């Protein structure tokens with residue numbers, strides 16, 4: 001609302017996971033979500049440090065990284081490293097997977113200048129992780145701590161980061177997931193988290209057992225909701241298994257929630273992702289009156305064929321469903337979302353947060 | 368014909384293979400789809416286990432077990448008897464260090480024996496390094512793990528009856544995926560010196576050197592029935608393909624796993640259909656000059672349609688006396704060029720076989736001269 005970003009922010013760029021084996025994790029996400037193998041940076045391409053692989057589906061970019069043996073790149077230094085990412089560390093990445101397990105490490109958002117966004121953020125209370133380093137004079141990258149061991153990454157451009165080999169040969173799955181809608185993190189105290197994060201970003205606040213506040217960018221396209229537990233708290237269950245604060249889930253905007261689900265739900269037993277139980281028929285019997293004008297009777301019955309939730313806000317309506325936890329622990333999962341309405345462009349598409357984020361379903365599921 | 372049948376204890380057959388992953392969920396989902404096994408048992412938080420996330424995949428009699436450690440803080444007050452783990456030999460630090468050094472690799476090789484209690488006492492009494500004393504689980508199954516090569520251990524499983532470990536809740540319906548794989552053929556490991564490796568393994572178990580290499584020194588071991596095959600390889604400098612393993616895996620470790628199949632032409636099309644969508648990449652197929660002379664040496668075994676299908680799938684073919692061998696190798700399963708998986712189907716060398724000769728047709732040694740080293 002106030003448009004008070006301390007620097008220019010374009011939109012969501014990529015989301016990087018820190019696995020123990022980036023091959024088996026990425027091969028499952030490519031088959032469970034339908035993403036194309038775009039770029040890669042492992043021992044095949046000549047990277048002795050980590051095995052980074054890129055999955056893309058529209059604008060969404062999932063990066064998976066697992067460190068190799070430190071003895072391979074033992075005779076190297078920071079200015080003379082082999083890793084395509086200069087902010088990487090073996091011991092720090094091993095501690096991320098030994099403590100937090102499979103989780104999102106870096107939430108990257110493209111800015112017009114990474115060195116500027118870093119210098120502005122640190123000068124306003126941020127905690128720097130890695131200073132801005134220009135990658136082959138083509139991409140500037142900086143990282144500042146978000147919550148816990150999650151970092152906020154700034155990327156500058158003058159398809160991906162240098163040092164990545166494009167994979168366009170026979171060695172393209174697409175189910176509708178186009179971009180990242182929002183990224184929700186869980187913190188022990190929502191107070192200092194909003195004071196810290198929004199302190200150096202200038203992000204305004206967009207507007208049981210949890211208290212959530214959504215941070216938004218200038219155009220409200222970068223949405224970073226933050227959650228705190230309410231003391232059994234389902235959010236506290238996250239912090240106990242994650243061993244500290246971290247990301248709860250990722251909202252993946254789909255161009256068509258109906259077919260995107262029918263491409264994933266038919267594959268949850270062959271290596272895909274599992275979903276939460278479907279709401280009782282009374283929810284869809286009650287759904288025909290709350291959003292009977294947005295969704296037709298033929299489209300509402302299709303929501304029950306896949307167990308999809310619907311919420312409504314101020315001139316906005318969104319459809320949503322949640323996957324089961326991705327890793328072993330009940331920590332990080334994935335939300336698939338499609339918003340209806342709020343379309344208003346001068347010359348196409350809509351704004352951000354069309355329909356809220358589904359807080360109306362917290363009571364509609366309890367009937 | 369050349370085996371003394373000098374088993375130190377009654378060895379029945381293969382059981383399972385335990386993978387110590389960092390996240391056993393994603394690895395098991397890839398193997399379930401890439402290889403085509405079937406999710407048949409679980410032991411995690413959904414069943415009451417707070418120590419490790421174990422997930423079982425079963426394709427015929429082959430059983431792949433994927434076990435990842437949970438947070439050490441979840442089991443802060445559990446002593447040794449009061450552990451909620453279905454596998455008591457599991458340990459947090461032993462698994463956090465196995466994946467930190469060896470990465471994604473095989474932790475244990477399970478072999479079904481008559482009495483793991485006796486198999487443990489006979490083994491340790493012959494120079495074996497014990498990794499886990501026998502533990503009677505649920506008064507039904509007894510397991511014992513003895514150190515093999517490196518950090519991989521030899522696991523014994525015994526039953527008081529003539530499905531899996533107790534505590535593993537079944538999966539009622541997991542998709543019944545089955546691409547053709549039936550059982551485990553042989554398991555190979557890499558060591559710096561082959562000498563002290565054969566004297567050790569054959570010393571505490573009584574296995575015999577099997578008898579029915581550019582870049583390695585092979586020596587297969589087999590039991591009395593010869594259904595349990597465990598080859599070992601050592602590098603020959605002047606870079607050897609094993610020195611690459613010993614440098615990436617950081618020491619010894621299980622090389623690959625050969626998986627039997629009732630039809631290698633059936634399993635390969637399913638895995639190659641998926642090699643680009645979450646499956647397993649394979650090694651580059653031999654040139655067309657490999658399948659022309661193939662019609663002359665093994666043309667009296669396969670048909671013109673089957674040999675052309677071998678070229679379509681790029682299947683390596685080698686033949687010895689009394690049985691031919693069809694094999695093909697996948698690219699490394701993990702991030703590092705360490706562990707991969709072999710698909711094999713032997714023909715001929717048969718008997719009654721109610722409900723095939725053990726390891727007949729060789730192991731692909733002729734393909735070290737034919738295709739390349």
Ligand SMILES: Cc1cccc(C)c1-n1c(=O)c2cc(C(=O)C3=C(O)CCCC3=O)ccc2n(C)c1=O
Pocket residue numbers: 184212225234276322335357358359361362365
């Ligand atoms: C999936 C699950 C598992 C165990 C316990 C519970 C409460 C849930 N759970 C959700 O987490 C959930 C989350 C959102 C959601 O999008 C969300 C918020 O509502 C707050 C703002 C930030 C944000 O992203 C909406 C609906 C939800 N519903 C309906 C639901 O049941």
Ligand SMILES: Cc1cccc(C)c1-n1c(=O)c2cc(C(=O)C3=C(O)CCCC3=O)ccc2n(C)c1=O
Pocket residue numbers: 553555582583585586587598599600608650696709730731732734735738739740
């Ligand atoms: C696939 C590849 C990539 C890069 C380097 C190389 C040597 C290879 N490679 C093999 O690894 C390979 C392995 C076996 C095999 O299964 C095996 C042996 O290694 C000996 C001991 C017992 C045993 O079963 C057979 C044939 C092979 N051939 C022909 C081959 O080329």
Ligand SMILES: [Co+2]
Pocket residue numbers: 182184249251335357
């Ligand atoms: Co959400």
Ligand SMILES: [Co+2]
Pocket residue numbers: 553555623625709730
């Ligand atoms: Co083999």
